[PDB]
Design a protein around this ligand. Structure first.
Ligand code: NAG
Ligand code: ZN
Ligand code: ZN
Ligand code: ZN
Length: 266
């Protein structure tokens, strides 16, 4: 996701964590604001463009070697790769926070976890096709961009009505209410099924697999002919909105559950 997506995921999670989890995080981050997670939720996207953080670029995705829209699926060993991936990063950074939450590596670990749980839920961060769709040029609202970009940024920013922290907060609030009492409030009871703080690979793969099914059902189900030739800010946006909204909600909720586990220090 772009910044708005990551901040919305972070604010959602802030709404569901226990108060000891909040303190646990605020202490690591040195931030006692009511935006403590949101404020660090984009950091990994900065860090990967620095010389020192270049090595972390692959941690944003798992390039699923599947065949969408006909066939979707993710496999850790097949798809992660030689330089690591979202899944291996969640394992490594989760275990740092389980082993040394007060150590020097915990600050970046937590920043990573907040960001990457977000990324795992962007379906094109779980998809190899044309560099996760970065190679698929498309027209969005009369302007040229790419398919990955409109999922990261154009479409969420349109649905949220902007891109500022306060817009992310308002968006998070809307989605959090969907989880509590609205359209997600039944389904959400099963969004943490299979979660296991002692198996970060398996837990994060479930989330990645889940998000990846939407490559076939939604991202690409019209076919590349349509996608390459149609302005995607029309009916494509309308079809995609419920899906990216639910995924951002799942990301927030799952992030909170995972942070509550880490803070509980098993
Ligand atoms: C769509 O465009 C992508 C490149 O951006 C290309 O690889 C693909 O072959 C195109 N497919 C069709 C059906 O136009
Ligand atoms: Zn992202
Ligand atoms: Zn992206
Ligand atoms: Zn990212």
């Amino acid at each position: 996701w772009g910044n708005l997506g990551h901040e919305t995921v972070a604010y959602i999670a802030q709404s569901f964590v226990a108060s000891s989890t909040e303190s646990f995080c605020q202490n690591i981050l040195g931030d006692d604001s009511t935006s403590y997670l949101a404020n660090v939720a984009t950091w990994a996207d900065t860090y990967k463009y620095t010389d020192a953080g270049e090595f972390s670029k692959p941690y944003h995705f798992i390039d699923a070697q599947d065949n969408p829209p006909q066939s979707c699926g993710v496999d850790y060993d097949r798809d992660c790769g030689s330089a690591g991936c979202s899944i291996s990063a969640i394992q490594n950074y989760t275990n740092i926070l389980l082993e040394s939450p007060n150590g020097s590596e915990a600050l970046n670990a937590l920043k990573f976890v907040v960001h990457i749980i977000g990324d795992i839920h962007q379906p094109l961060h779980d998809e190899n096709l044309e560099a996760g769709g970065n190679g698929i040029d498309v027209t969005y609202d009369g302007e040229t961009t790419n398919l990955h970009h409109i999922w990261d940024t154009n479409m969420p920013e349109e649905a949220a009505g902007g891109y500022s922290l306060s817009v992310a907060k308002t968006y998070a609030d809307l989605l959090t209410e969907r989880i509590k009492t609205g359209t997600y409030s039944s389904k959400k009871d099963s969004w943490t099924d299979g979660i296991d703080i002692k198996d970060p690979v398996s837990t994060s793969m479930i989330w990645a697999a889940d998000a990846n099914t939407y490559v076939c059902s939604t991202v690409l189900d019209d076919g590349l002919a349509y996608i390459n030739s149609t302005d995607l800010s029309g009916e494509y946006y309308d079809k995609s909105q419920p899906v990216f909204e639910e995924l951002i909600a799942k990301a927030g909720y799952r992030l909170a559950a995972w942070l509550d586990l880490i803070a509980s220090q098993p």
